[PDB]
Amino acid sequence: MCPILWTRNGSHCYYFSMEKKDWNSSLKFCADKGSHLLTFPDNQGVKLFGEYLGQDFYWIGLRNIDGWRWEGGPALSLRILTNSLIQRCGAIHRNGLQASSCEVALQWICKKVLY
Amino acid sequence: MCPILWTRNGSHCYYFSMEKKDWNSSLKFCADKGSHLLTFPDNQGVKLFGEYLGQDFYWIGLRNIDGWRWEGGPALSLRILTNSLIQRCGAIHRNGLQASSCEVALQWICKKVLY
C-alpha cells in the first residue's frame, strides 16, 4: 500500500504537502522521495482531479522552459491561465491550471506508482 | 530533434558536459534546462550505457540521503563501489557505479524527452 502520509487513487500514491516550497524545492522533495511532481502526460483529467482540491494552489510538474511542457512528458495541450508572460511554473487548484512565478512558495503534490 | 550540444539515443536526448561541477550544481544545471540528472530507475542498463564512457566519472542522479536511491526513482539495487561510508553521491564510468564526495567536481549527464 501507499507509504504513511501518502494518499492512494487508482494505481498511484500521491503526496499532498502541508508545507509550502518554491517550485525548485518542491521538485527536490518529490525526487528525494522516489517520486515526481504531479503531471497529466495524457493531457487529461485536470478538471476531474481538481475536484478534490480547493482554491489554494499546488505546484505540479509543469513549466515553460522551452514551451509549456509536462516534466519528463509531452507538451502542454491544455490551457494554463497565464496572467504575466514571465511566469514559467505551473500550479493546479479546483478551477484548473495557472502559471505563477517559480519563486512563490506553494504546497505541492508528488506522484508515484503503488508498489 | 535534440537541441544542439545534446545527443540522441532512442526516445531521449542526453547532455554530456565538458566542464565539471559538484553534484548539487550538476543537478541544478539539468533542472534549469528542463531535464534531469541521469538515472536508471529500473535498476538496469548501467553496464550497457557505460560502454559509451571511459575511465572519467560523470555525476548521475544517484544519492544516499535516506539510503542509496535514484532521484525520482526507487532504491538502488545495483552495487555501487563505495570505499568510504561518508561518500553520498553517485557517479558512472565505463566500469560501473562508484560513490564519491558530493563536493568533487565532475562532468555530468542530463537526460530529457526527445521532441
From Swiss-Prot, chains A, B:
Annotated glycosylation sites: 9, 24
Tissue expression notes: Expressed specifically on natural killer (NK) cells and activated CD8 T-cells. Not detected in spleen, thymus, lymph node, testis, brain or kidney. Not detected on mast cell lines, bone marrow-derived mast cells, or peritoneal mast cells.
Location (main, coarse): membrane
Membrane topology (Extracellular): 2-115
Keywords (A to Z) from UniProt: Cell membrane, Disulfide bond, Glycoprotein, Immunity, Innate immunity, Lectin, Membrane, Phosphoprotein, Receptor, Signal-anchor, Transmembrane, Transmembrane helix
Cell membrane keyword on record: yes
Cellular component terms per the entry's GO annotation: intracellular membrane-bounded organelle; plasma membrane
SS bond list: 2-13, 30-110, 89-102
Upregulating conditions: By pathogens and viruses infections.
GO molecular function, one term: carbohydrate binding
Residue span, C-type lectin domain: 9-111
Modifications after synthesis and translation: Phosphorylated in response to monoclonal antibody G63 binding and antigenic stimulation.
Swiss-Prot/TrEMBL domain comment: Contains 1 copy of a cytoplasmic motif that is referred to as the immunoreceptor tyrosine-based inhibitor motif (ITIM). This motif is involved in modulation of cellular responses. Upon phosphorylation of ITIM motif KLRG1 associates with the two phosphatases, PTPN11 and INPP5D.
Subunit structure: Forms a monomer and homodimer; disulfide-linked. Interacts (via ITIM motif) with PTPN11 and INPP5D.
Biological role: Plays an inhibitory role on natural killer (NK) cells and T-cell functions upon binding to their non-MHC ligands. May mediate missing self recognition by binding to a highly conserved site on classical cadherins, enabling it to monitor expression of E-cadherin/CDH1, N-cadherin/CDH2 and R-cadherin/CDH4 on target cells.
Protein name (record): Killer cell lectin-like receptor subfamily G member 1
Entire protein: shown range: 75 to 188 of 188
